[PDB]
Design an enzyme around this catalytic site. Sequence first.
Site, PDB file in Angstrom:
ATOM      1  N   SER B 141       0.818  -1.210   0.000  1.00  0.00           N
ATOM      2  CA  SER B 141       0.000   0.000   0.000  1.00  0.00           C
ATOM      3  C   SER B 141       0.853   1.261   0.000  1.00  0.00           C
ATOM      4  CB  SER B 141      -0.928   0.002   1.214  1.00  0.00           C
ATOM      5  OG  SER B 141      -1.605  -1.236   1.340  1.00  0.00           O
ATOM      6  N   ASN B 194      -5.101 -11.873   3.476  1.00  0.00           N
ATOM      7  CA  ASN B 194      -6.176 -12.637   4.101  1.00  0.00           C
ATOM      8  C   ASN B 194      -6.092 -12.579   5.624  1.00  0.00           C
ATOM      9  OD1 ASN B 194      -7.262 -13.311   1.619  1.00  0.00           O
ATOM     10  ND2 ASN B 194      -6.151 -15.257   1.473  1.00  0.00           N
ATOM     11  N   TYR B 200      -7.914  -5.269  10.113  1.00  0.00           N
ATOM     12  CA  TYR B 200      -8.020  -3.879   9.661  1.00  0.00           C
ATOM     13  C   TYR B 200      -9.071  -3.074  10.421  1.00  0.00           C
ATOM     14  CZ  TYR B 200     -12.358  -4.546   6.904  1.00  0.00           C
ATOM     15  OH  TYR B 200     -13.651  -4.802   6.501  1.00  0.00           O
ATOM     16  N   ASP B 234     -22.227 -15.550   4.586  1.00  0.00           N
ATOM     17  CA  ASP B 234     -21.290 -14.425   4.536  1.00  0.00           C
ATOM     18  C   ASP B 234     -20.644 -14.471   3.154  1.00  0.00           C
ATOM     19  OD1 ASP B 234     -19.271 -12.510   4.704  1.00  0.00           O
ATOM     20  OD2 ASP B 234     -18.643 -13.045   6.715  1.00  0.00           O
ATOM     21  N   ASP B 261     -16.059 -17.556  -0.381  1.00  0.00           N
ATOM     22  CA  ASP B 261     -14.983 -16.715  -0.895  1.00  0.00           C
ATOM     23  C   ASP B 261     -14.321 -17.453  -2.055  1.00  0.00           C
ATOM     24  OD1 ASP B 261     -12.432 -14.925  -0.887  1.00  0.00           O
ATOM     25  OD2 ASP B 261     -13.676 -14.036   0.687  1.00  0.00           O
ATOM     26  N   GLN B 264      -8.777 -19.952  -3.276  1.00  0.00           N
ATOM     27  CA  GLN B 264      -7.446 -19.667  -2.747  1.00  0.00           C
ATOM     28  C   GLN B 264      -7.498 -19.006  -1.375  1.00  0.00           C
ATOM     29  OE1 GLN B 264      -8.495 -18.842  -5.846  1.00  0.00           O
ATOM     30  NE2 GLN B 264      -7.336 -20.353  -7.043  1.00  0.00           N
ATOM     31  N   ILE B 284     -18.612 -14.224  -6.456  1.00  0.00           N
ATOM     32  CA  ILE B 284     -19.667 -13.225  -6.291  1.00  0.00           C
ATOM     33  C   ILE B 284     -20.238 -12.738  -7.617  1.00  0.00           C
ATOM     34  CG2 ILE B 284     -18.842 -12.414  -4.043  1.00  0.00           C
ATOM     35  CD1 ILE B 284     -17.432 -10.149  -5.362  1.00  0.00           C
ATOM     36  N   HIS B 303     -17.649  -2.343  -2.140  1.00  0.00           N
ATOM     37  CA  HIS B 303     -16.966  -1.054  -2.117  1.00  0.00           C
ATOM     38  C   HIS B 303     -15.688  -1.068  -2.946  1.00  0.00           C
ATOM     39  CE1 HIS B 303     -13.766  -1.695   1.246  1.00  0.00           C
ATOM     40  NE2 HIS B 303     -14.012  -2.832   0.621  1.00  0.00           N
ATOM     41  N   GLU B 332     -21.182  -1.802   4.986  1.00  0.00           N
ATOM     42  CA  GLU B 332     -20.246  -0.951   4.264  1.00  0.00           C
ATOM     43  C   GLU B 332     -20.304   0.468   4.803  1.00  0.00           C
ATOM     44  OE1 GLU B 332     -18.033  -1.897   2.072  1.00  0.00           O
ATOM     45  OE2 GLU B 332     -18.853  -3.330   0.629  1.00  0.00           O
ATOM     46  N   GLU B 359     -15.505   4.687  -1.771  1.00  0.00           N
ATOM     47  CA  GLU B 359     -16.649   4.559  -0.881  1.00  0.00           C
ATOM     48  C   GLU B 359     -17.817   5.398  -1.404  1.00  0.00           C
ATOM     49  OE1 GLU B 359     -16.667   2.262   1.384  1.00  0.00           O
ATOM     50  OE2 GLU B 359     -14.552   1.874   0.958  1.00  0.00           O
TER      51      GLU B 359
HETATM   52  C1  LIG Z   1      -7.700 -15.399  -4.672  1.00  0.00           C
HETATM   53  C2  LIG Z   1      -8.138 -14.740  -5.946  1.00  0.00           C
HETATM   54  C3  LIG Z   1      -8.363 -15.681  -7.092  1.00  0.00           C
HETATM   55  C4  LIG Z   1      -8.319 -13.432  -6.050  1.00  0.00           C
HETATM   56  C5  LIG Z   1      -8.084 -12.373  -5.014  1.00  0.00           C
HETATM   57  C6  LIG Z   1      -9.375 -11.732  -4.546  1.00  0.00           C
HETATM   58  C7  LIG Z   1      -9.174 -10.509  -3.695  1.00  0.00           C
HETATM   59  C8  LIG Z   1      -8.435 -10.735  -2.411  1.00  0.00           C
HETATM   60  C9  LIG Z   1      -9.627  -9.323  -4.091  1.00  0.00           C
HETATM   61  C10 LIG Z   1      -9.739  -8.052  -3.304  1.00  0.00           C
HETATM   62  C11 LIG Z   1     -11.190  -7.618  -3.249  1.00  0.00           C
HETATM   63  C12 LIG Z   1     -11.446  -6.335  -2.511  1.00  0.00           C
HETATM   64  C13 LIG Z   1     -12.875  -5.880  -2.501  1.00  0.00           C
HETATM   65  C14 LIG Z   1     -10.474  -5.653  -1.921  1.00  0.00           C
HETATM   66  C15 LIG Z   1     -10.582  -4.269  -1.346  1.00  0.00           C
HETATM   67  C16 LIG Z   1      -9.963  -4.050   0.023  1.00  0.00           C
HETATM   68  C17 LIG Z   1     -10.713  -4.267   1.184  1.00  0.00           C
HETATM   69  O1  LIG Z   1     -11.995  -4.723   1.085  1.00  0.00           O
HETATM   70  C18 LIG Z   1     -10.178  -4.038   2.458  1.00  0.00           C
HETATM   71  C19 LIG Z   1     -11.003  -4.293   3.691  1.00  0.00           C
HETATM   72  C20 LIG Z   1      -8.881  -3.575   2.544  1.00  0.00           C
HETATM   73  C21 LIG Z   1      -8.129  -3.343   1.414  1.00  0.00           C
HETATM   74  C22 LIG Z   1      -8.659  -3.571   0.144  1.00  0.00           C
HETATM   75  O2  LIG Z   1      -7.950  -3.349  -0.989  1.00  0.00           O
HETATM   76  C23 LIG Z   1      -6.809  -2.865   1.819  1.00  0.00           C
HETATM   77  O3  LIG Z   1      -5.843  -2.564   1.168  1.00  0.00           O
HETATM   78  O4  LIG Z   1      -6.790  -2.783   3.179  1.00  0.00           O
HETATM   79  C24 LIG Z   1      -8.044  -3.237   3.734  1.00  0.00           C
HETATM   80  N1  LIG Z   2     -14.993 -12.718  -7.333  1.00  0.00           N
HETATM   81  C1  LIG Z   2     -15.036 -12.977  -6.030  1.00  0.00           C
HETATM   82  N2  LIG Z   2     -15.792 -14.027  -5.560  1.00  0.00           N
HETATM   83  C2  LIG Z   2     -15.846 -14.303  -4.210  1.00  0.00           C
HETATM   84  N3  LIG Z   2     -15.139 -13.527  -3.323  1.00  0.00           N
HETATM   85  C3  LIG Z   2     -14.390 -12.497  -3.777  1.00  0.00           C
HETATM   86  C4  LIG Z   2     -14.329 -12.197  -5.127  1.00  0.00           C
HETATM   87  N4  LIG Z   2     -13.517 -11.127  -5.278  1.00  0.00           N
HETATM   88  C5  LIG Z   2     -13.069 -10.744  -4.062  1.00  0.00           C
HETATM   89  N5  LIG Z   2     -13.610 -11.584  -3.125  1.00  0.00           N
HETATM   90  C6  LIG Z   2     -13.401 -11.555  -1.669  1.00  0.00           C
HETATM   91  O1  LIG Z   2     -13.928 -10.391  -1.069  1.00  0.00           O
HETATM   92  C7  LIG Z   2     -13.196 -10.108   0.115  1.00  0.00           C
HETATM   93  C8  LIG Z   2     -12.966  -8.600   0.207  1.00  0.00           C
HETATM   94  S1  LIG Z   2     -11.974  -8.034   1.616  1.00  0.00           S
HETATM   95  C9  LIG Z   2     -13.310  -8.263   2.815  1.00  0.00           C
HETATM   96  C10 LIG Z   2     -13.086  -9.481   3.711  1.00  0.00           C
HETATM   97  C11 LIG Z   2     -14.162  -9.675   4.777  1.00  0.00           C
HETATM   98  N6  LIG Z   2     -15.491  -9.654   4.179  1.00  0.00           N
HETATM   99  C12 LIG Z   2     -14.018  -8.605   5.847  1.00  0.00           C
HETATM  100  O2  LIG Z   2     -14.726  -7.596   5.851  1.00  0.00           O
HETATM  101  O3  LIG Z   2     -13.174  -8.726   6.733  1.00  0.00           O
HETATM  102  C13 LIG Z   2     -11.915 -10.936   0.053  1.00  0.00           C
HETATM  103  O4  LIG Z   2     -11.972 -11.970   1.014  1.00  0.00           O
HETATM  104  C14 LIG Z   2     -11.923 -11.560  -1.325  1.00  0.00           C
HETATM  105  O5  LIG Z   2     -11.400 -12.873  -1.335  1.00  0.00           O
END
Ligand SMILES: CC(C)=CCC/C(C)=C/CC/C(C)=C/Cc1c(O)c(C)c2c(c1O)C(=O)OC2
Ligand SMILES: Nc1ncnc2c1ncn2[C@@H]1O[C@H](CSCC[C@H](N)C(=O)O)[C@@H](O)[C@H]1O
Lengths: 395, 395
Positions: B141, B194, B200, B234, B261, B264, B284, B303, B332, B359
């Site tokens: 970040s 994760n 956070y 969830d 989710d 991975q 999703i 978001h 949210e 947001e």
């Molecule tokens: C495993 C795979 C195939 C793909 C990866 C999916 C994935 C992790 C995607 C991200 C989806 C997403 C909405 C992320 C958006 C998101 C947050 O919401 C929160 C709380 C935080 C951050 C953030 O980027 C962050 O930097 O600090 C907290």
């Molecule tokens: N295409 C998709 N299908 C299912 N989950 C997804 C997705 N793209 C992103 N996500 C999931 O959305 C989450 C956003 S971060 C939010 C994590 C959790 N809901 C919390 O508030 O603590 C991550 O866990 C990521 O794996």
Amino acid sequence: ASPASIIQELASAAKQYENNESGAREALIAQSRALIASLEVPSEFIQHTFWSQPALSAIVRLATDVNLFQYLKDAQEEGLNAEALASKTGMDVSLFARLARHLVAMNVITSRNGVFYGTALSNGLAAENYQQSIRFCHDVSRPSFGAFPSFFKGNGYKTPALGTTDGPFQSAHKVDISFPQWLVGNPPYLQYFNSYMSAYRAGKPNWCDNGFYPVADRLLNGFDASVSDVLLVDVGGGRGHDIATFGSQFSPLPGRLVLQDREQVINSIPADESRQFEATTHDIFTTQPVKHARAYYMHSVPHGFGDEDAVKIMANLVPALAKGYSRVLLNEIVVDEERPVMSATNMDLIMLAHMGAKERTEADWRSILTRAGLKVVNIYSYPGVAESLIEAELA
Amino acid sequence: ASPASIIQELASAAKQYENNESGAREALIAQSRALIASLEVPSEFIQHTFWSQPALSAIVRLATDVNLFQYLKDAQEEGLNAEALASKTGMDVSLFARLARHLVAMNVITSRNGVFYGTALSNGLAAENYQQSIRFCHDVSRPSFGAFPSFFKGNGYKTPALGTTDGPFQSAHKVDISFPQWLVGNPPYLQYFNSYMSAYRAGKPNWCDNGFYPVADRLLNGFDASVSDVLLVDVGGGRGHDIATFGSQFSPLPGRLVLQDREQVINSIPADESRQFEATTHDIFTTQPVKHARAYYMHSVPHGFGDEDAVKIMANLVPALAKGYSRVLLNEIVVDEERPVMSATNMDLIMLAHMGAKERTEADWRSILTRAGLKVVNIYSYPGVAESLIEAELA
Ligand SMILES: CC(C)=CCC/C(C)=C/CC/C(C)=C/Cc1c(O)c(C)c2c(c1O)C(=O)OC2
Ligand SMILES: Nc1ncnc2c1ncn2[C@@H]1O[C@H](CSCC[C@H](N)C(=O)O)[C@@H](O)[C@H]1O
Ligand SMILES: CC(C)=CCC/C(C)=C/CC/C(C)=C/Cc1c(O)c(C)c2c(c1O)C(=O)OC2
Ligand SMILES: Nc1ncnc2c1ncn2[C@@H]1O[C@H](CSCC[C@H](N)C(=O)O)[C@@H](O)[C@H]1O
């Protein structure tokens, strides 16, 4: 210290601030920071340290590119809404609003009914010396701090040996040259640094202010033009901001004021016929050419150098000192390492991030001075200000 | 505002905090940050924003490499002096003390008579999920924010059009793939992320806590296993920390809890025979497979996506909802653009620096939900909590 205990100590510091006691403003700030830390849960510390502050740094830097603080200053008590400021800055309105809303949240500007308004802070940041300070800090210093973890993992968590060429600055900016040489080789950052030096501690009491160092008793009283017509020399004084203040405080002056710095710095001084000092070229690693002056002054100079260079810098004054007359005035931070405070650690880390150097305790300074052929007369300090004033004389 | 007026509000909120009033802890931090803003001169703001905080970030990052907070946690109230911690961490004792003294000055650890002690903060940061958060934030970040000035200078000061592929994240990390794809392609940062999602906003009131969303009256009351045996899904719940918190507060559960989710993420959850939820893979952007559940819950998910995607995310629940029975719970941030607050500006800018997203206001969310075929029943909020709880239903 519990939150209830800090709340009381803040309320007692507020009363002293209301009584206008010296350093009570700074004490009130430090109590407010201790209260925040006693209350924030760890997640909030993470969000403030790694989300809020890096974003603040980025936006404030971006502000200098688009004239944001100058537009809000010129708008005065009227302010400007997001549409107006987006139109002046050439920014997308939604982008601007989102960035300005973080500034509001961070207390840098204010908002009311959709309108944005300057603050004393944002109005102050509109000045060109602060514009160039922000640019230097974000483009130059910030990557050096970002490289601390990888650099120190890579060097075995060792203090940089020579300081000048084996530190985090060189690794961050991908060079093998010292920071001063980097400055000369990477315009416009030499000039930004020169502007920056008039800003890094501005608005705080000066060494020569009332209640701090007794200039009139130690320097003016007994000044003798038969020994030398020079009253004070500022060794490494930059563009002259420090010596200019001194002249304004103690006029009519009984003798000359001589500014010394490197030629590239001296050439950058705007011409002014009201000037009270003579801008001269002198390298602190050669013997001091002005002889028997009443005072030789340094501010934030040997703190950027290792022990051997710091001993040379001070020893090069010795041949010019008139016994029983010339004062050596070292305006530098004195680390009280049993009582750590941010004014000292900030500069110490800035010294590590740029010159691979460090700030010193009274014992370290006493040792460098004694090795230089000098001895301490007295050390002066003022509440709230980072630096002390060490008076020294021929050993 | 005036300092003397912030002094009173800080004292007023202090009384409210000592009465354990909702959000009074968060309002006292806010009044403390407002007083500091009213007292600090621009040079102090420069040193804090551009020296203290970037130095703090790096030292906290470096701490995770040398097990610092863990050693201070083990030492409990005995603490460790600089020589001991230097020995344990493998750092030069001079370098360690200088870096440790900045943690003291910044209130992260304490010092007395040359001994360093852990705090509630530093002890909390020793936990692995915070260690990995720190690593993610400084490595991933931090450069994204650091690229804000150059990126928006170059792109025309425009909002990222696609968001996912045309943002400062791609510019900082020198790629042209999405942040989610970057995560998968750059271990260990996916799994760091994760763990990060359990930290956070940890230590803050949850949507389901007492005095926030009335889970019992809205969900448990009227639960009908003849409609479906699932109480709550969830959707995008990461490793399940949120759904686990829910299960423990409302046991014995009358129906199933299902986590969804990416595979991975799901396959990174430690095996646990006491777990109360079923861990499943689900995209999703495909139709919700669990049919007619009492609640479909989302936290910090749409978001991160633009309007067209966020509509699909909400709309993909619609075919699964049982009319008059299924609740949609969207947890949210609801931006109040008449009142900018750090909790929303933090995550807004985080959304910009990673996802190119943002947001949303209550108007924005209502428009997305209406486009997805949903309508808002009520919106719940809680003092000091960044997020709201929007309850929606089939249109
Ligand atoms: C495993 C795979 C195939 C793909 C990866 C999916 C994935 C992790 C995607 C991200 C989806 C997403 C909405 C992320 C958006 C998101 C947050 O919401 C929160 C709380 C935080 C951050 C953030 O980027 C962050 O930097 O600090 C907290
Ligand atoms: N295409 C998709 N299908 C299912 N989950 C997804 C997705 N793209 C992103 N996500 C999931 O959305 C989450 C956003 S971060 C939010 C994590 C959790 N809901 C919390 O508030 O603590 C991550 O866990 C990521 O794996
Ligand atoms: C002109 C020429 C030949 C070379 C460049 C000479 C030069 C500017 C050298 C630097 C000397 C020096 C002691 C620098 C050390 C120094 C400070 O003291 C102060 C207060 C500050 C910084 C700093 O690096 C800084 O980043 O923020 C404030
Ligand atoms: N070798 C050298 N000879 C003379 N001046 C030098 C020098 N090396 C660095 N300096 C000067 O020392 C100063 C250190 S920064 C301090 C500037 C000023 N004294 C102030 O406190 O505001 C810079 O202006 C730099 O140009």
